[PDB]
Scaffold this active site. Structure first.
Site, PDB file in Angstrom:
ATOM      1  N   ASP A 214       0.959  -1.283   0.097  1.00 21.88           N
ATOM      2  CA  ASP A 214       0.049   0.139   0.131  1.00 21.88           C
ATOM      3  C   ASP A 214       0.728   1.136   0.047  1.00 21.88           C
ATOM      4  O   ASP A 214       2.216   1.407   0.295  1.00 21.88           O
ATOM      5  CB  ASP A 214      -0.956   0.100   1.257  1.00 21.88           C
ATOM      6  CG  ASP A 214      -2.313  -1.001   1.131  1.00 21.88           C
ATOM      7  OD1 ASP A 214      -2.129  -1.681   0.050  1.00 21.88           O
ATOM      8  OD2 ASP A 214      -2.908  -0.836   1.652  1.00 21.88           O
TER       9      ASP A 214
ATOM     10  N   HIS B 222       3.654  -2.126   3.149  1.00 16.25           N
ATOM     11  CA  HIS B 222       3.671  -0.710   2.868  1.00 16.25           C
ATOM     12  C   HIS B 222       4.943  -0.316   2.185  1.00 16.25           C
ATOM     13  O   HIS B 222       5.900  -0.568   2.824  1.00 16.25           O
ATOM     14  CB  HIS B 222       3.434   0.357   4.124  1.00 16.25           C
ATOM     15  CG  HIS B 222       2.156   0.280   4.713  1.00 16.25           C
ATOM     16  ND1 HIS B 222       1.729  -0.691   5.323  1.00 16.25           N
ATOM     17  CD2 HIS B 222       0.894   0.874   4.473  1.00 16.25           C
ATOM     18  CE1 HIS B 222       0.439  -0.473   5.757  1.00 16.25           C
ATOM     19  NE2 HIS B 222      -0.199   0.465   5.059  1.00 16.25           N
TER      20      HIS B 222
HETATM   21 ZN   LIG Z   1      -2.828   2.893   3.305  1.00 15.99          ZN
END
Ligand SMILES: [Zn+2]
Length: 225
Positions: free
Chosen positions: A18, A167
């Site tokens: 992400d 992430h």
């Molecule tokens: Zn996010």
């Protein structure tokens, strides 16, 4: 619009990322490509960088069969937005992928994992085929943050069919976790697939997007300002 959080293909495993792209993405993709592993990327338009400044990475990613999907333009709390604001939030990411890649995404993942009936209705109206959640969290954005060693050890126990949240914007995820856990997962028999393939949808990348037109050339419109 279906909501997915777990793979269905036996032996499959989905590494997902992400908030990218980011300054470490070429390194991450090189690591994935060297192992023949495929990642799933839920990108932002204007959050940790302007998506237009990442055009070159996006193109390499797109043409190498990695899955690219929307994470909204501004990384908004989608439950606090109206139909119209959410549609704009999705539209701006669509527009950037149309200009850079010639395609629109067909999937998305909500920021913070927060969604409601209005989000699902906007996804349906805009032609999306799925909302992709996850079933294991690396912890790489928890605070305090687990060490790389701790995250890597958690990956040793994630089962088959995991959709794992990571992430791209965390340097240690790119530089420590992912180089260590690709061999762990591949050597134990897992196939590192994109989310659509791991769900038994298509494994042909063209099926993950809507062809709109030929990719554009960079001009003055390639801006988040
Ligand atoms: Zn996010």
């Amino acid at each position: 619009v279906p909501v997915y959080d777990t793979c269905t293909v036996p032996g499959s495993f989905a590494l997902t990322f992400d908030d990218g792209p980011y300054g470490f993405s070429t390194r991450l993709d090189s690591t994935l490509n060297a192992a023949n592993a495929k990642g799933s990327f839920f990108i932002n338009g204007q959050n940790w960088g302007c998506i237009y400044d990442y055009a070159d990475v996006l193109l390499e990613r797109f043409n190498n069969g990695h899955f690219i999907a929307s994470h909204t333009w501004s990384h908004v709390h989608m439950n606090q937005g109206t139909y119209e604001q959410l549609s704009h939030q999705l539209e701006l990411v669509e527009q950037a992928m149309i200009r850079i890649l010639g395609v629109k995404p067909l999937y998305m993942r909500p920021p913070y994992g927060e969604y409601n009936d209005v989000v699902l209705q906007v996804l349906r109206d805009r032609g999306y085929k799925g909302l992709i959640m996850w079933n294991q969290d690396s912890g790489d954005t928890f605070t305090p943050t687990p060490s790389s060693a701790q995250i890597i050890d958690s990956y040793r126990s994630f089962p088959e069919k995991t959709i794992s949240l990571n992430h791209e914007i965390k340097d240690f995820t790119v530089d420590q976790v992912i180089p260590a856990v690709i061999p762990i997962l591949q050597q134990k028999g897992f196939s590192l697939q994109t989310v659509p393939e791991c769900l038994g949808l298509s494994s042909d990348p063209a099926d993950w997007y809507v062809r709109v037109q030929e990719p554009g050339t960079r001009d003055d419109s390639w801006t988040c300002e």
